[PDB]
Amino acid sequence: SMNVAISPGVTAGNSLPFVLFGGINVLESLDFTLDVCGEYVAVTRKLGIPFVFKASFDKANRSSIHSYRGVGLDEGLKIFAEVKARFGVPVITDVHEAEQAAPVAEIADVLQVPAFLARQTDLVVAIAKAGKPVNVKKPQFMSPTQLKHVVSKCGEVGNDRVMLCERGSSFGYDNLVVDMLGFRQMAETTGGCPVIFDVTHSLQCRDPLGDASGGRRRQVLDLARAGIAVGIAGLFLEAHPDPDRARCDGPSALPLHQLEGLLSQMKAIDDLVKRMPALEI
Amino acid sequence: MNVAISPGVTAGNSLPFVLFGGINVLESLDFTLDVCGEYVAVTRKLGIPFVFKASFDKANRSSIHSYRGVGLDEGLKIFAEVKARFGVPVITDVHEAEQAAPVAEIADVLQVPAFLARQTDLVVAIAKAGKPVNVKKPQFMSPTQLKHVVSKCGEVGNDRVMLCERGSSFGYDNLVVDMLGFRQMAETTGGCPVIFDVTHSLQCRRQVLDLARAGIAVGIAGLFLEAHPDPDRSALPLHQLEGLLSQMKAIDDLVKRMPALEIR
Amino acid sequence: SMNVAISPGVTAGNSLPFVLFGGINVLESLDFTLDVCGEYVAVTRKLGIPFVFKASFDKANRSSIHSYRGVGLDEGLKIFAEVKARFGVPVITDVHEAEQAAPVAEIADVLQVPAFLARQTDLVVAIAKAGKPVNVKKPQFMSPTQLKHVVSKCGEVGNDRVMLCERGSSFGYDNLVVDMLGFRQMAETTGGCPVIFDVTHSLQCRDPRQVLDLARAGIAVGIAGLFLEAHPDPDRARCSALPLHQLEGLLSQMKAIDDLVKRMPALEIR
Amino acid sequence: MNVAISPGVTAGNSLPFVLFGGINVLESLDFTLDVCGEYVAVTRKLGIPFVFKASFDKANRSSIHSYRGVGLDEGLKIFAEVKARFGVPVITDVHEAEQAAPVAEIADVLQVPAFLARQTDLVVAIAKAGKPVNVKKPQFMSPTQLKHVVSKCGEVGNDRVMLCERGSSFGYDNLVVDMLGFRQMAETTGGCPVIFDVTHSLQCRDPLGDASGGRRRQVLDLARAGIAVGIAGLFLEAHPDPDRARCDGPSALPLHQLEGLLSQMKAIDDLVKRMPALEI
């Protein structure tokens, strides 16, 4: 069981109290990001949950060219700077090109490898070389025993602060399932890397003929309870005050007024299961 | 809908979980009495409602000479002695329509095998026998499609139906449990109790605690479990029962007192 | 060899010209059955394709107890007897309960194990013991290398005349895919049983009409037979079926492809 | 629609199939020339239109320790020698936006890798470079969503897009080919040419492996099925001794079997391209 140091007082580990990697899908404006982060900060401080603010500066992989992509790298890094200065919390964002790794690492405290891109050697190596902890989204196409090779790429250039994020596996066409057995397989084939659960993207599904993802936000509690009960290092979550109006993955986003309600149940379950042993062997 | 199984045993999705626990196949009277005894002691100590499980026949094994159990006549005699001795209700699976009535005289719950869940005459003969029914969800069936089998049971007068998750086909020779399916099963069938068969879900590519925790945390009516004192010689090793069940009860008591977020 | 003889002039084999196991979903009336069988016979004769007429006497797995189930066993065997007498064609039907196997075997030339029921020991043994060739529908949930256990069960009670029928594999919820690599797996792991492709029930898939694409792909692999259901107006049918007027069009493409691949060699790729 | 690739090579779903055939990865000039030479001899003899394929880089090997190929600069020089020596058009894959333009100066078709087909700036870069594009369908993408990749290419002025089947995720560590996908790809994209990558479609793997498995012994089963549907092309990799290939050896056709495979493909293709749809 390895523990990954993110910032003062924030360390992720499979035996430790869970860390919330929480925020929004996509950066739209400064004031909206500050307001939503402000709400996450209030709730996580109230409940004593360690917190890392999440947002994407770009959606580089939208299905349609007409779908919204975000403010982009230059404006996104400025919004993150203001989040950090305003709230004093660390931030997490994803990186889509090798040349983005260094500039992003000047501001972000964790760099994320997107799910479709986790096998791309030069991107992973560039992210790892940037010197921050790395969150690897497990591809929809990848068995949980194969993530070890992604971790070895990071380790090869000297970065041993790697976390592994579950976000669902392809189940026929246009649907995901979460294999709850995958968490242990990920941890035990990688020397105990912290395992995180993206309950938001795991809820994705879609219409065969659709222009954008569908999703299953009404069931977020079902999935979040089940995952946190396994015993894991972190929970990855997106929210929006009105999910029907979100610009990306609205169908899977938690309504922001339900945040305290969800997190109080996560803490209660995490506090309970983190004290329970393995069965006697 | 809560389903009354016997005095002091009612399964329901908002109620404390019921353990449907026992062994894979009936082999002898004395060994069945001994294992059921261990299940009774642990569940009584922990305070978990209990229904004893065993099959009288394995009707779907890979060779005609492979061991099938004591069979119907002998199995029912064993079940009669389990009930008389421990005062416990019992659940067993029915493989042929004509077994329904005889099984129903002794068993308190009749189970529909997963492969057979769509066979009209078997389901109807089971439903008509007048005891609560447990329907194993086929590996091949989506969780919004169980409603038809429940309606078949209702069409011959049986509204005491429970639904059991045992995994979904995931490529060749492998099963995954979609934890989103529990709510689907309950909501599309008017709120039938949902049960999670942790043992047969693990017919897949050590792992039982992880999966049992995950399922119980969703908030469900029951857990379905097989054990053996020495599984080698997917059954739980019998000495781990108390350790497993105390984790199950603590998680279950917690989630059953926390509310739904009605997320729109 | 591992070729299965069904009746005079009709043998199924992975290296032989393909056999059509062709007919209808369910027996509803004598005259409708004779009319459709009549058409299959006329087309298959014209094209020179060996033919076995298919029908179920009961649909045992409909979604309501009040849903129409067909004429039933007694009336069904009566209908098959008149089909055999009128056309001199062998017949295949599926058997759902152990006790049906013997009386069905008096009349039918091939007995079929339903897909959902292929692991049920007493049903399969009763079917195998009745002494006719057996067609095993591969269950949606079963891998192509596991069918061998069903075939062994049949051999353990004296039946070495077993054929294996692809009908799709589970692919997420409410959808089937046909894995074209599984035909060879089925054949090779069972000592060379004839493999058959059920194009009709394989098309119980999503369609966000495609029978031709799929039949061409399957027959091109090089297999023992095609399983097909048809109806004059499928939408007004009782319980996926090909429009009957397209039968000759479909089968002429199937014959031309089959004749071609059956005279080109397997490559031994190490 | 028909996609003109070079003089005497046009791909289309009603046309005689085009072979996009070659090797998995460029290792050296002489081996590339020798293998390309055998493909050119065999296709010319049989009368099959031909585009030579190879990767200059494998940018997505599972292991950091696995072989990647000669790389962009040396790869482009090999391709220039292959073109001058045989007069064959070539196809290669592109992994970063900035590679598209230099690649297009030499390659005659540019390929989008399966895992990267949703990456907007990559697809747009590739499209803008002015050559026909081959899009590998992701293992995670349904056949009716390829239309969105085609629209990205269209949005920047490139309507010469072909769509390549290479299998779909089937549980863990396995692929299946849905033969009903070809039509769905063609009919939702205004009739783009559909290609079938028989080689990568055969991939499977060991859960604890370091590299891909594969099922080359079944390449004929699969290739027959797919060509019989009625498609625009076949995508194929070979090696003289597949066990020693440095990438995807488990799925590679033994090179001495090339003429035998291809003669069957031509026979089935010529037959099916003469047969109509069923009467409505």
Ligand SMILES: O=P(O)(O)OC[C@@H](O)[C@@H](O)[C@H](O)CO
């Ligand atoms: O454009 P659609 O189909 O909604 O796809 C959404 C994705 O871009 C989004 O989930 C993204 O992968 C977050 O990383």
Ligand SMILES: O=P(O)(O)OC[C@@H](O)[C@@H](O)[C@H](O)CO
């Ligand atoms: O490195 P392994 O796991 O063999 O994976 C091989 C892939 O890189 C290869 O298929 C590539 O996608 C195109 O050849």
